Amino acid sequence: MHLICQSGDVLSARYEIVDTLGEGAFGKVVECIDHKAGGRHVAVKIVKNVDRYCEAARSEIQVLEHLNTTDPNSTFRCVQMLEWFEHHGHICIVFELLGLSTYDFIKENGFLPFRLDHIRKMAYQICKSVNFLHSNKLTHTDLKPENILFVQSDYTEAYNRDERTLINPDIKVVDFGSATYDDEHHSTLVSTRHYRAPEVILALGWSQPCDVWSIGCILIEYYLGFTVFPTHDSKEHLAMMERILGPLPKHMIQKTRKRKYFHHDRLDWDEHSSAGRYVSRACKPLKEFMLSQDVEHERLFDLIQKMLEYDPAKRITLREALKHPFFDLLKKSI
Numbered sequence: 001m002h003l004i005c006q007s008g009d010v011l012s013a014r015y016e017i018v019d020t021l022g023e024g025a026f027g028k029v030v031e032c033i034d035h036k037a038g039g040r041h042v043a044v045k046i047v048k049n050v051d052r053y054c055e056a057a058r059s060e061i062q063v064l065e066h067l068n069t070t071d072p073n074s075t076f077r078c079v080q081m082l083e084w085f086e087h088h089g090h091i092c093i094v095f096e097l098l099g100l101s102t103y104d105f106i107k108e109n110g111f112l113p114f115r116l117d118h119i120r121k122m123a124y125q126i127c128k129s130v131n132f133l134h135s136n137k138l139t140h141t142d143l144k145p146e147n148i149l150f151v152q153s154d155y156t157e158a159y160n161r162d163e164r165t166l167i168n169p170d171i172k173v174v175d176f177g178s179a180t181y182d183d184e185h186h187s188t189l190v191s192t193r194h195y196r197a198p199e200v201i202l203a204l205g206w207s208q209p210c211d212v213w214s215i216g217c218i219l220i221e222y223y224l225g226f227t228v229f230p231t232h233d234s235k236e237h238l239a240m241m242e243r244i245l246g247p248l249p250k251h252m253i254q255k256t257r258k259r260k261y262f263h264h265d266r267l268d269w270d271e272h273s274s275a276g277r278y279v280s281r282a283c284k285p286l287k288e289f290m291l292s293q294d295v296e297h298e299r300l301f302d303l304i305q306k307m308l309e310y311d312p313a314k315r316i317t318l319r320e321a322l323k324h325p326f327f328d329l330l331k332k333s334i
C-alpha cells in the first residue's frame with residue numbers, strides 16, 4: 001500500500017495523486033487530478049491487495065453500478081462512482097470528490113456536537129439515502145459517522161469555547177463494501193462495527209432494521225459529540241444497552257443461541273468488575289443525555305428512542321422515520 005499512494009503518483013495513466021484524504025481498514029482514499037476529464041478532481045479508493053478487502057471492493061463496485069444506474073441524478077445522495085481500475089494489482093475505485101467525514105469534522109472541532117438544526121437536516125438526508133437502499137433490497141450494515149461525508153466541509157468559527165459551524169451541512173453516504181442484498185448470504189457472524197444492533201450481537205438474523213439502529217446511534221453521537229456505546233466488547237455493549245435503554249426483551253433472550261452472554265433469564269454481567277464500574281459511570285438512561293428540555297430536543301430524542309427499539313420488527317422503519325415530527329420544520333412552508 002505504502003508504495004503506490006504518494007503524491008505525484010499517476011494511476012491508470014490518468015489520475016495524478018495530489019493528497020491523501022483518509023485511511024481505513026480497506027486501504028486508503030486519495031485525491032487525484034483526472035487528466036482525461038479536463039483536470040476534474042476525483043477521490044480514488046485504493047484497496048489493500050488482501051483477499052477479504054479485494055472481495056469487498058468487487059462487491060462495492062457491483063452495488064455502486066446498480067445504485068448509480070437506478071439513481072443517475074444522485075437524488076438520494078449515495079456516493080457516485082465514476083469508474084474503477086487495477087493498479088499494481090490493487091483495486092482502485094474512482095468517486096466524485098467529497099469533503100470531510102462527519103466523524104473527522106467532530107474530531108477537528110474538539111468533539112463539539114453539531115447544532116440541532118444541522119442534525120435535523122443531516123438526519124433527514126441520511127434517512128432518505130438509506131431508505132433508498134432499503135427500497136432496492138439492500139442493507140448498508142456499516143453506517144457510522146466516518147461513513148457519512150459532507151459534500152463540502154467549509155466552516156466558520158465563533159466564540160460560544162470556540163466552535164466551527166458548517167456553511168452547508170449536505171452529506172452523502174459512502175462505503176458500500178459491506179452492503180448486502182436481501183437474497184444474498186447474510187453473515188450471522190458480523191465483524192467489528194462502531195454500533196452493534198442487538199439482533200446482530202445475538203445472531204437472531206439481521207436485515208434493513210440494523211441500519212436504523214446504527215442511524216439512531218449516529219444521531220446521538222451528532223448531538224453529544226461522542227458515542228453512548230464507547231466499547232468494542234459485545235457483552236459490554238449489551239450491558240451498555242441495558243443501562244441506556246432498559247432490559248433486553250425476554251422474547252429475544254429466549255430465542256438467541258448466544259448463551260455465552262446470559263445466565264438464566266438475564267445478562268450475565270458483573271457490575272462491580274472493571275468493565276462493570278465503567279459501564280455504570282459512562283452510561284445512563286437515554287433521555288438523561290438531553291442537553292435541553294426544549295420541544296425540538298424532545299422530538300429528536302423521541303425519534304432516537306424509536307430507532308433504538310430492541311426488537312427489529314417493532315423498530316421504526318426509515319419510511320416511518322421520515323414522517324416523524326422532528327422533521328416537520330423541514331416541511332414545505334405553509
Ligand SMILES: CCOC(=O)c1c(/C(C#N)=C\N)c2ccc(Cl)c(Cl)c2n1C
Binds near residue numbers: 147
Ligand atoms: C475511513 C477512511 O475513509 C475515507 O477517508 C473516505 C471514504 C470511505 C470509503 N469507502 C469511507 N469513509 C470515502 C468514500 C468516498 C469518497 Cl468520495 C471519499 Cl472522498 C472518501 N473518503 C475520504
